[PDB]
Amino acid sequence: LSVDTKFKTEGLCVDIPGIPKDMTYRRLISMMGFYPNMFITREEAIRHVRAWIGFDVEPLQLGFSTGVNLVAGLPWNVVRIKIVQMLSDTLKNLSDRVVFVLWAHGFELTSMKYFVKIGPERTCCLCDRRATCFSTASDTYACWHHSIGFDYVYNPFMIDVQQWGFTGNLQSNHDLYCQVHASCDAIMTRCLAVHECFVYPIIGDELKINAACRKVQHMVVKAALLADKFPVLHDIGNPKAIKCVPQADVEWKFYDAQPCSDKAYKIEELFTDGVCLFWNCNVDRYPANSIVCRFDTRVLSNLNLPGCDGGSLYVNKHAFHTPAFDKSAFVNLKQLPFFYYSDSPCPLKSATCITRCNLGGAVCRHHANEYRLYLDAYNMMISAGFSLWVYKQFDTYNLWN
């Protein structure tokens, strides 16, 4: 983002009366009292969504989308220490930076000089990550992991949503899309920005989660077909359009539905023969003859960011805004019970290890190993926030035969 790009300044003229209408980023940064630009493009912001922290200023009340309000009542030299600590603990497992997301009216921008320092890009003094903080006590730099005791934010980034072309004030623009939400403005601001852009690097267990989801899907569907012998399966929303049980006898019919990022699909808009499979295809109410995996937006993980109108921004390779978890959607189904099924050729005791060996009295070692690995993946999937539901007649007792 060129520092010579124009900044629309009408939103600032109540806190800064008389501000020129003609204004570049270069001149605004100078006026803020200060890595080509502190400000970034929408595109760049989107690529670093994990780094977003709503920030509003209203003595001055500083509010962040973490829900914290600070009053700068204590002097700036202690307030800045709290800011560094809060951002480090919020972001250290999400991002190599911070992006302050503003609805800029002026005070938030003139207050930056009291807790921000800028300079060349640097590296942490204790590791190889880019530096995000600076300490005036030791004249050293640190990343979010090693910033304990550091008093200044270093080379933050920032983006003013009001530059995107909105009519009306923040609240009225936010409330058009979200009924769930200084800190309250910081939250609305980030929320509105997530809605505009969404309604990525490996930072955690992405790869184990995705392999576990693939394994569970194959297990549960294969077993549903064996136990109930459905003649046809309606696979709704498959992004890959690959059969998850390619050797099953059934007639596999695919129906295309992109991941709904706003409201859940209405089943009437989007089948009574056989079984319906919804693997992360979010509808308002699932038919009774369904196998379903639905992500619980309420779960706490480094992969799951707070979203708009109760949904969450699930970032796992790609960004997937997901509508709010609603228990009533599953009213025609029951929770899927854990089980492990295998027909592969053959000390574990388990009533839910459904294999020939266990049927005959004693689980062989191979199926003991595979059961324990499968349990591990299953638990990884549940902990990651996924929930599984199945048609009410599903009964693993039917697998023994």
Ligand SMILES: O=C(NCc1nc(C2CC2)cs1)c1n[nH]c2ncccc12
């Ligand atoms: O489900 C998988 N990964 C977790 C994800 N969850 C989301 C959104 C919040 C719903 C996007 S990705 C997966 N990864 N490979 C697979 N193969 C077969 C079936 C599922 C998977």
Ligand SMILES: [Zn+2]
């Ligand atoms: Zn470090």
Ligand SMILES: [Zn+2]
């Ligand atoms: Zn909101």
Ligand SMILES: [Zn+2]
């Ligand atoms: Zn066995």
